[PDB]
């Protein structure tokens, strides 16, 4: 799990997280997410941030809350 | 130059160009960008974006054109 | 043409234009657009509306105008 | 019922749901709605979203929730 | 006329002008408002701003132009 | 009391009340404003909407409420 | 002059100039501001920055540009 | 400490506070700031007000608590 179970459950490569609450320009990863380093890297590659969001759709500014450590 | 000159004539590196207008999460370049294919190089190098746009400070939103060349 | 060529050129599917200017909420047709009719309808069906925008990419707000007629 | 009761209590038809959270180009629903199946078949019929919103006054953007059912 | 012709060519009245832009919490005109003074009268019994438009719809946000005489 | 005591506290005339929570153009009432009627006529006469605002302070976007009844 | 004559040519204190386009938390001059400087130090003492605003008007967030040299 | 502990516990000078909410046009203290007095003291000497921010970054906007003691 590189995000929680819940609310900010649905990993995302983002652009951007506007005010650490709005992920923008986010589309989901391309490969398989299972540790911190994966989920990051598979982003910065990207040019995207890892973010956790409330949805696992892609293009739409939804919330969403950085991944832990990153 | 990479950027035009009149009013969107500062490249920077930035997350994203909502609406297409205004950069957010910018950065002055740290090297000096003189083709197209060099400045996205140099943006990519943080998953950024090259921009041109109206001011030389990155700090606070910013209105800003696609680079051409990227 | 369903949009006029030039800045307002690209017709997309959009749920909403905010301030008449920002498509929000944009997907691609996905089928041919020859006519105002096949447009409007076209999108009305998607639970979108015909829109014109500045660019032929789907989800990510941007300036758009609504189709004429419409 | 076709939304909670509490806080987003209101049925309402919108274009879209900014974040999830803000309801756009909303309009009271013109018949009685009391399945959810019925409720975004009432919105189709208006390339809207069934939502789930703070208020019944459909004038002036809201706080949405997204149908359960739909 | 108590509006311009060409872009801002609408009277409605709302709440207040957002950046003298745009116009927010608007209503139609219900009575036909031929001078300034009148404009701002049947406004003031709303509580709203006499403002100019760019369109004759009142339901989401519009671009709107303070009126003159008022 | 127009206003709960706590966050909402503060009662003061407002153009509109975005979201239903952000207070625009309020300026505090010249009179005073012991019941939901007094409170009320005297902002629907500045044309203002009686809220309920987390700061005692007028002119400057800020989180408000309605008041209860109006 | 401090201020060009025309649209921005209402020169206020704002604690800060909004993608250089909206000057927010604008209040007016308590002194006479006839050069740069006085209109600079006059701003930066109200812990406020000199611009150049569509209205001499204060507390509501408009159209500014900054003063030139500052 | 000058500001709480848990969510906004990071002292950064900003130009405003919009909404009490968003921190705005803000900077790392560049000095140790162990007193309110001493915090708006560094803080005036920016023409920025002292805030209480969800994080130590100064770049983006930011959720921020007006500062006690000031
Ligand atoms: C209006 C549509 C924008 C896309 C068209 C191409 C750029 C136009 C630049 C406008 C002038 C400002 O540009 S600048 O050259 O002065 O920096
Ligand atoms: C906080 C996450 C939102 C998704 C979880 C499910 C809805 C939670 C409703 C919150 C209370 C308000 O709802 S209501 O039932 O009172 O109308
Ligand atoms: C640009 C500054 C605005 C204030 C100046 C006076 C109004 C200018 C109207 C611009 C054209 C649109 O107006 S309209 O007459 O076509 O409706
Ligand atoms: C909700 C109203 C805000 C004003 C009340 C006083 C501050 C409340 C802090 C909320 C918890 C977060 O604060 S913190 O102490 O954890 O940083």
Redesign the interface.
């Known amino acids: 799990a590189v995000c929680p179970t819940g609310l900010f459950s649905n990993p995302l490569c983002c652009?951007?997280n506007?005010?650490?609450?709005?992920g923008?320009?986010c589309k989901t990863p391309t490969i398989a997410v299972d540790t911190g380093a994966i989920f990051q890297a598979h982003?910065?590659s990207?040019?995207?941030?890892p973010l956790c969001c409330?949805?696992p759709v892609?293009?739409?500014?939804?919330?969403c809350q950085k991944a832990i450590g990153t």
Chains 1, 2, 3, 4, 5, 6, 7, 8 share one sequence.
């Open positions: 652009a951007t506007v005010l650490d609450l709005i923008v320009d982003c910065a990207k040019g995207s941030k409330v949805a892609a293009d739409q500014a939804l919330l």
